Design a protein around this nucleic acid. Structure first.
Lengths: 135, 113, 250, 37, 132
RNA sequence: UUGGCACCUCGAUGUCGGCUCAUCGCAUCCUGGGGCUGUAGUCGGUCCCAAGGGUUGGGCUGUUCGCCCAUUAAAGCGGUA
RNA sequence: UAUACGUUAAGUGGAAAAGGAUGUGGAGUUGCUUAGACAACCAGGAUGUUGGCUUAGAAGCAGCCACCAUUUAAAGAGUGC
C-alpha cells in the first residue's frame, strides 16, 4: 500500500484523463512489460495486488519495475450526509493513467512466464491492457 | 535441406564402401531387444543404422523392398542377424546385397549358414 | 530476576503440558506395520492382529469405513502432526532456556559488577528491548608475578576484552561451572602463582560468591567460542578446584 | 455442468466446441464439462 | 520385481515382507537364501530381481550395486548434495571412476569404458560429486 | 434498504402494524425434470430448466422483524402509494 | 421494394461491462511442407536410474536441487492420468 510520505495539499481536484500519456510509453528498464489501452485511476491496493500476484507466480523472478506511483489523493465524504459543508476527507491514494502508458515491467524471466504474470495482474486491474516488449 | 543432401551423400558413401549389407524391419520389438542386437553387432564390428525410405532410395540411385520400415546393417553379420531373428521372430529380413549384387532372402540366409 | 523466574516457570508450563501428547511412535510403527500388511486386510474391519518385526503380536484398531491404505496414511498423518508439535515445543524450550541462561550469567555479572559495566549492561538490555533509555572496557587490579589481570562484570565488556584485548594463544580464566565472570591478563601466560591467583578472582565474582569449593577453568583463548550474547563455550581447557578470597585478590 | 461465462479448457484433453451458437467444453472428466449461460 | 536390499540383512521385514506377501511365498526362507548367496558386505544394497511364475516358482537374481552406493562408499559419505551445482560437497578420484566403470561394464549398454564413465559422471553431477 | 437531489402534490396525495381481498415477477421453499459431486445406499450439497398449483397454527411483543413450542412436502424472497 | 459493391444472420439492428470463445469478413507477418508436412492408423517410446536431497516411504511425477551420459532414429534424470 504505497504512500507519498509528504504532500503540499491533502485535497486536490480530481482532474481529467484526456489524451495519451506523456512518457513511460515503452519498456526500457525491463524486457517484457504491460501497457494500458484506456484511462483510469488506479489505487495502491490494486497495484500491490498485482505486484504480489506476479511475484507469487514468479517466486524468484528477476525484477519488476512498477512505473507509477499513486501521488494523487482522493476524498470521500462520510456516509449518509447531505451535500456541502466543505470538501470530504481524504480516503486513499491514486495514480492517474493515460493510455499508451506502461505500468509494470519484467526482466530476468522468459516471455511466457512474463505474459502469464502480467495476465494475472491485468485481471486484478480494471482496465484493458496489452503485452509489450522492448525494441 | 542441404542437411538431407549431406545425409544421402554419406549414405551412398558407406554403401559403395561396403560390400555386404542387409536390409531389415524394426517393428514389433522393444528397445531392449534392439540394443541387444546393437551390442552383439558392436562386438561383431558390424555397423547397423536407421534411415528413411525416401533418402535411402535417393542414395541407392545415387528397389521394391525400400518401402515400409527399414533399418540397415553394413559389413564391409547375417549370421548374428538370423540368429536374432530365430530368437525373436518379430522381424522382416527383407533384403540384402553383396559387392553391389542384390542378395535374396535365401541368399543372405545361406551366408548366415 | 522477574524475567528469568518467568521464563523458568514458562518452560515448566511447557514441560508439564508436553506430557500429554506423545503418541508419535505408536502411530509411526502402526503405519509401518500396516504398509507391511496391506494385503491381508479388508476395507471394512475394526482390528488387525499384527506382528512386530522380539516378535510380539499387536492388535491395531481401524476405521471400519476406511481402507487399510487410508488408515495407515492417517497414522502417518498423526505421527507427522505430533512430530511437528513436539518440534515446536522443543524450539520454545530452547529459546526459553537460552534466555534463562543469559539472565543467569547476567545476574552473576550484576553480582560481581561495577557501575562502569552496569551502565553498559543497561544499554545491552535496552538493545534487547527489555528496557528503554565509548572505549572504556576493562577493569583490573594487582596479580601474582607483579602482573595485571583484567576483568569485566558486564557481559559486553567481558566479550570486548576477550576478543579485542587479547590474542588467540593467550589464556582465559573463568568458572568451570554454571555462571561467573570472565577475566584474564594480557597474554595470560604467567606462572602457576598467577594461575591460582586468577582462580580467586574467578571465585569472587561467581554465581556463588564465598563458595569454598568453586572450580575455575583456564583455557587458551584460541579455543574461546564466540558463538544469546555471552553464550561462550570453551575448549583447550583445564580445570582446578579453588575457592573465593578477599580484597587481597586485587 | 459448470455453467459460467468464463468458459475455458482445464486439462489438455478438454476440448472447446460450439453448439446451438453456445460455447461448451468437452472432456471425459465431467467436472471439466462447461457451458456459457 | 526389483528390490534394493542390503546383502547380509535379509528379513528386515517391513520393507520386504510386503514385497512378496502379495506373492505369498515364504518370506524368511527366501531371505536367508538371499543372505546365503549374498554373503557380502552387509550394508551393500544389492539390486535383486525376482520373478515368480504363477505356481510359485520363484527365481531371483542379484546384481551390481547402484552408482550412488558405490560413489558414497568411495567418497566415504552418507548423502549426495541437497543442492548439486549450488553446493558440491563430495569428491572422488578418476581412478575410482575407472574402477566402478570396469565393475559395472557387464550390466550397462555402453560397450565403451569411457562412455560408461560419462554415464557415471552424469550420476556424479546429479549427486553433487566432483572428480579428481 | 439506509440514503443523496428537491422534480408534482401544503386552495390537504392520511402516515406503521393488523383483517378481508387478491394480483404480478422469479433471483424457486415444496412438488416435477436433469448435470456434477469430496454422489456407496437412505439423506444430501451445488448448478441448470421450470412461476402450474401450494407455501400452517400458536405464545411474547402495538409491532414489522425476531425468539420460542408443536407441525408440515414445504412453512419462499419481493413489487403493486 | 432504386443502382453498384461488400458485411452481418443475431431479429444484431431494436439496451450494458469486466471477461470468455476454432463465429465470420478483409488484409498483413511467419514456421513446416511431395527429398513427402498436420491429423489419423502401426510400432517403439529404453539404460546408469528408483537422478540425488528431503521423506517412514517419494522409485519419471508431495517438495528441494540438478536435469547429465549411453542404445541411440529418438525417448524428458520425464506431459498428464
Amino acid at each position: 500500500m504505497l504512500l507519498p510520505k509528504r504532500v503540499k495539499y491533502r485535497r486536490e481536484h480530481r482532474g481529467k484523463m484526456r489524451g495519451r500519456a506523456k512518457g513511460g510509453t515503452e519498456v526500457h528498464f525491463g524486457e517484457f512489460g504491460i501497457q494500458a489501452l484506456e484511462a483510469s485511476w488506479i489505487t495502491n491496493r490494486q497495484i500491490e495486488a498485482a505486484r504480489i500476484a506476479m511475484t507469487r507466480y514468479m517466486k524468484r523472478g528477476g525484477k519488476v519495475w512498477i512505473k507509477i506511483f499513486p501521488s494523487k489523493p482522493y476524498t470521500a465524504k462520510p456516509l449518509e450526509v447531505r451535500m456541502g459543508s466543505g470538501k470530504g476527507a481524504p480516503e486513499g491514494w491514486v495514480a492517474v493513467v493515460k493510455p499508451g502508458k506502461v505500468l509494470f515491467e519484467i526482466s530476468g524471466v522468459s516471455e511466457e512466464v512474463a505474459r502469464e504474470a502480467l495476465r494475472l495482474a491485468s485481471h486484478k486491474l480494471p482496465i484493458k491492457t496489452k503485452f509489450v516488449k522492448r525494441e | 535441406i542441404e542437411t538431407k543432401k549431406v545425409v544421402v551423400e554419406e549414405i551412398a558413401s558407406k554403401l559403395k564402401e561396403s560390400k555386404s549389407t542387409i536390409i531389415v524391419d524394426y517393428r514389433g520389438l522393444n528397445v531392449s531387444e534392439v540394443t541387444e542386437l546393437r551390442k552383439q553387432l558392436r562386438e561383431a564390428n558390424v555397423e547397423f543404422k536407421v534411415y528413411k525410405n525416401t533418402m535411402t532410395r535417393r542414395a541407392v540411385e545415387q528397389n521394391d523392398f525400400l518401402t515400409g520400415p527399414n533399418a540397415i546393417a553394413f559389413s564391409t553379420p547375417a549370421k548374428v542377424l538370423n540368429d536374432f531373428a530365430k530368437n525373436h521372430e518379430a522381424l522382416e529380413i527383407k533384403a540384402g546385397v553383396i559387392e553391389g549384387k542384390v542378395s535374396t532372402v535365401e541368399e543372405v540366409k545361406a551366408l548366415a549358414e | 530476576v522477574n524475567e528469568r523466574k518467568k521464563n523458568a516457570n514458562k518452560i515448566k508450563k511447557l514441560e508439564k503440558t508436553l506430557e500429554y501428547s506423545e503418541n508419535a511412535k505408536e502411530f509411526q510403527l502402526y503405519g509401518e506395520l500396516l504398509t507391511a500388511n496391506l494385503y491381508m486386510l479388508k476395507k471394512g474391519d475394526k482390528q488387525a492382529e499384527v506382528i512386530n518385526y522380539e516378535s510380539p503380536t499387536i492388535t491395531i484398531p481401524l476405521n471400519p469405513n476406511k481402507t487399510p491404505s487410508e488408515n495407515a496414511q492417517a497414522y502417518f498423518t498423526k505421527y507427522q502432526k505430533a512430530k511437528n508439535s513436539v518440534a515446536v515445543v522443543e524450539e520454545q524450550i530452547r529459546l526459553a532456556q537460552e534466555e534463562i541462561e543469559y539472565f543467569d550469567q547476567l545476574i552473576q555479572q550484576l553480582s560481581s559488577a561495577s557501575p562502569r559495566d552496569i551502565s553498559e549492561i543497561r544499554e545491552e538490555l535496552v538493545e534487547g528491548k527489555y528496557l528503554r533509555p565509548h572505549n572504556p572496557v576493562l577493569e583490573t587490579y594487582e596479580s601474582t608475578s607483579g602482573l595485571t589481570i583484567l576483568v569485566g562484570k558486564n557481559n559486553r565488556q567481558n566479550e570486548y576484552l576477550t576478543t579485542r584485548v587479547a590474542a588467540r594463544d593467550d589464556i582465559w580464566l573463568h568458572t568451570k561451572d554454571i555462571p561467573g565472570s570472565h577475566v584474564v591478563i594480557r597474554s595470560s601466560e604467567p606462572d602457576e602463582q598467577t594461575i591460582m591467583e586468577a582462580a580467586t578472582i574467578a571465585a569472587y565474582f561467581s554465581k556463588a560468591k564465598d563458595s569454598s569449593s568453586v572450580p575455575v577453568d583456564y583455557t587458551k583463548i584460541r579455543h574461546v567460542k564466540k558463538p544469546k550474547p555471552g553464550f561462550v563455550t570453551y575448549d583447550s581447557q583445564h580445570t582446578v578446584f579453588v575457592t573465593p578470597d578477599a580484597d587481597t585478590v586485587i | 455442468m459448470k455453467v459460467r461465462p468464463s468458459v475455458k479448457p482445464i486439462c489438455e484433453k478438454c476440448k472447446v466446441i460450439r453448439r446451438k451458437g453456445k460455447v461448451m467444453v468437452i472432456c471425459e472428466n465431467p467436472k471439466h464439462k462447461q457451458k456459457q449461460g | 520385481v526389483k528390490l534394493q536390499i542390503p546383502a547380509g540383512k535379509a528379513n528386515p521385514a517391513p520393507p520386504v515382507g510386503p514385497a512378496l506377501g502379495q506373492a505369498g511365498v515364504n518370506i524368511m526362507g527366501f531371505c536367508k537364501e538371499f543372505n546365503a548367496r549374498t554373503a557380502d558386505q552387509a550394508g551393500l544394497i544389492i539390486p535383486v530381481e525376482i520373478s515368480v511364475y504363477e505356481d510359485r516358482s520363484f527365481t531371483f537374481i542379484t546384481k551390481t550395486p547402484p552408482a550412488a552406493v558405490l560413489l558414497k562408499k568411495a567418497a566415504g559419505i552418507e548423502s549426495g548434495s541437497g543442492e548439486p551445482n549450488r553446493n558440491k560437497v563430495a569428491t572422488v578420484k578418476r581412478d575410482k571412476v575407472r574402477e566402478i566403470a570396469e565393475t559395472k561394464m557387464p550390466d550397462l549398454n555402453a560397450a565403451d569404458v569411457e562412455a560408461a564413465m560419462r554415464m557415471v559422471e552424469g550420476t556424479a553431477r546429479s549427486m553433487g560429486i566432483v572428480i579428481e
